[PDB]
Amino acid sequence: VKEFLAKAKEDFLKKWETPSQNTAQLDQFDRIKTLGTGSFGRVMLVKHKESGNHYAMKILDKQKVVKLKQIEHTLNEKRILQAVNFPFLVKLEFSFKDNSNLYMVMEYVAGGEMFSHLRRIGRFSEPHARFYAAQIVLTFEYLHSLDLIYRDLKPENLLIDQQGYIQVTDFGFAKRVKGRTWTLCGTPEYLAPEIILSKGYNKAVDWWALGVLIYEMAAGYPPFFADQPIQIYEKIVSGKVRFPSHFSSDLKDLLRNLLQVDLTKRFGNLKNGVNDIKNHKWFATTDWIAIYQRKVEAPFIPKFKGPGDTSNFDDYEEEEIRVSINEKCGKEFTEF
Amino acid sequence: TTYADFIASGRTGRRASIHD
Ligand SMILES: Nc1ncnc2c1ncn2[C@@H]1O[C@H](COP(=O)(O)OP(=O)(O)CP(=O)(O)O)[C@@H](O)[C@H]1O
Ligand SMILES: [Mg+2]
Ligand SMILES: [Mg+2]
């Protein structure tokens, strides 16, 4: 692994230092349907004219981003996404901008969000949850080795590809930092107590989030839930966690070490780092190399009928892409 | 049950991220 990570780092640094820009333009794509909406725009299924390939186009409104002080995060998102390379990370195919918007064209993951499958099915069996978890563990090991913190782990950001494997999307809060950071960002149910407490935090928050993810996948509901975020935060900081009766002893033990408020005890943040997790009894049957190579038997393969199929995604209200005749926020997004 | 309480709660749908 150390050998692999060292090379991955070199590759990453080259792109981080000299990012690619303007690798396509708007008229090269026919917009089909919205796959999801966000605070600064939306993600749409699109078809690239010349190739006929389908992609997911994330659209960001510049003025909006600037008004809401999210410039740095947006720049982080694209700079990082274009530089990473891993089997479980969605690939950024093209990127460009125009008078009004920023565009990030990713490979299209037709299988839909893990979220929809999870809610529909109710909960995943342990081996099924474990299959997904192993993938996130290897992804975090990779990202962390590059001084990157993901910051938004949740089923809604995890897509299932045609092989039944995970493709992580939404690097909106990804950031390259050595040491601690302070931004209050993420998704309520997945926030680690140190984030909520405004005390400064590090990569350890991704490991706590993994804990929440594993718990949600296996239980069918989050360990800390309520009607309002504020109520959720109180539960998270209290630390009290209760496990469903069906949880194995191993799962509960792993979870108690991930959903650990004490930073000196949280798995993934100790002397042995990721190895404390990889070597845990819950992952005993996990063949890490096989997982990385995508050779393990996927527990579930989404039904897909032809490219361009969006049957695995909910429907959203369509809207017209507006492109002003005047350039908006040009200086702010020069590097994009 | 906990499941029933979650299912009747207002946060069972897609969750949006927060910032700042
Ligand atoms: N490469 C891809 N293939 C298929 N669908 C994708 C995709 N990238 C994103 N999506 C879909 O679009 C949705 C929104 O994308 P994304 O999460 O990046 O937007 P956002 O960051 O504005 C939402 P938030 O920050 O609130 O979580 C995803 O939850 C997913 O359903
Ligand atoms: Mg998202
Ligand atoms: Mg986001």
Which residue, among A159, A151, A155, A160, has the nearest Cα to A182 in the 3D structure?
A151
Residues A141 and A276: their CA atoms lie apart, in Å, by 12
Judge contact between A61 and A100, C-beta under 8 A: yes
Which residue's structure tokens are 């037709």?
A110
Distance CA A151, CA A138 (A): 16
3-state secondary structure string across A104-136: EEEECCCCCEHHHHHHHHCCCCHHHHHHHHHHH
Structure tokens at A236: 């998270």
Closest listed residue to residue A58, CA positions, set A181, A143, A159, A150: A159
Q: Name the nearest CA neighbour of A187 among B20, B6, B3, B19.
A: B19
Residue A82's SS3 state is coil
The C-alpha atoms of residue A98 and residue A144 are separated, in whole angstroms, by 33
Amino acid identity at A312: N
Compute how many other C-beta atoms are within 10 angstroms of the C-beta atom of residue A302.
Answer: 20
Report the C-alpha gap between A32 and A320 in whole angstroms.
11
Closest CA to A32 of A231, A313, A330: A313
In angstroms, the CA A203 to CA A143 distance is: 10
DSSP string, A182-200: ----B-GGG--HHHHTTS-
Altogether, the residues listed in chain B come to a count of: 20
**Method in brief:** X-ray
Question: Which SS3 state, helix, strand or coil, does residue A96 take?
Answer: strand
Q: Answer yes or no: are the C-beta atoms of A34 and A27 closer than 8 Å.
A: no
Residue ranges of domains in chain A, CATH in brackets: 1-18+113-303 (1.10.510.10), 19-112+304-334 (3.30.200.20)
Separation of CA A135 from chain center: 12
Query: How far is C-alpha A17 from the geometric centre of its chain's CA atoms?
Result: 23
Resolution (A): 2.2
Residue linked to tokens 């150390």: A2
Closest of A183, A180, A160, A162 to residue A172, by C-alpha: A183
DSSP structural state of residue A148: E
DSSP per position, A7-33 = HHHHHHHHHHHS-------GGGEEEEE
How far is it, in rounded angstroms, from Cα A186 to Cα A190? 7
Structure tokens at B11: 């946060």
Q: Which of A68, A69, A186 sits opposite B17 (nearest CB)?
A: A186
Provide the token pair at A233: 């935060």
- Token couple for A221: 């509901």
Provide the Cα torsion A108, A302, A212, A266; round to 10°.
Answer: -80
DSSP string, A165-234: -EEE---TT-EE-SS-B----B-GGG--HHHHTTS-B-THHHHHHHHHHHHHHHHSS-SS--SSHHHHHH
Contacts of A331 (CB under 8 A, 6+ apart): none
Cα–Cα distances in angstroms (integers) from residue A112 to residues A116, A117, B10, in the given order: 7, 8, 22
Closest partner residue to B18 among A38, A187, A314, by Cβ? A187
Integer angstrom CA distances of residue A305 from A170, A302, A309:
25, 10, 6
State in Å: Cα A250 to ligand 3 middle.
32
* Residue type at A102 in one-letter notation: L
Check if A250 is active-site: no
The Cα–Cα gap between A38 and A58 comes to: 9
End-to-end CA, chain A = 32
Listed in sequence order, the residues at least 6 apart from A242 whose beta carbon sits closer than 8 Å to its beta carbon are A223, B2
**What is the CA(A123)–ligand 3 centre distance, in A?**
24
CB atoms inside a 10 Å sphere around CB A227: 11
SS3 state at A63: helix
Beta bridge partners of A113: A159
Asked if the C-beta of A19 comes within 8 angstroms of chain B's C-beta atoms, the answer is no
Matching residue, tokens 């990721």: A274
For strands A166-168 and A148-149, give the pairing: unpaired
- Backbone torsions φ then ψ of A219, nearest 5 degrees: -90, -35
Instruction: Choose the catalytic residue: A61, A152, A161, A170.
Output: A152
Class of residue A322 by CB neighbours under 10 A (exposed 0-12, middle 13-18, buried 19+) = exposed
Residues 6+ apart with CB under 8 A from A193: A208, A236, A237, A239, A261
Tokens of A296: 């393990």
A93: helix, coil or strand?
A: strand
Which secondary-structure segment (H or E) carries A102? strand A101-107
What is the distance between the alpha carbons of residues A70 and A207, in angstroms, rounded to a whole number? 25
Cβ atoms of A247 and A218 within 8 Å: the answer is yes
Is A269 marked as a binding-site residue? Answer: no
Task: List residues bridging with A89 in a β-sheet.
Answer: A168
> Which of A191, A196, A225, A313 to mutate: most B Cβ within 10 Å?
A225
Q: Are A220 and A176 in contact (CB under 8 A)?
A: no
- Contacts for A259 with CB less than 8 Å, ≥ 6 apart: A208, A211, A212, A215, A223, A239, A241
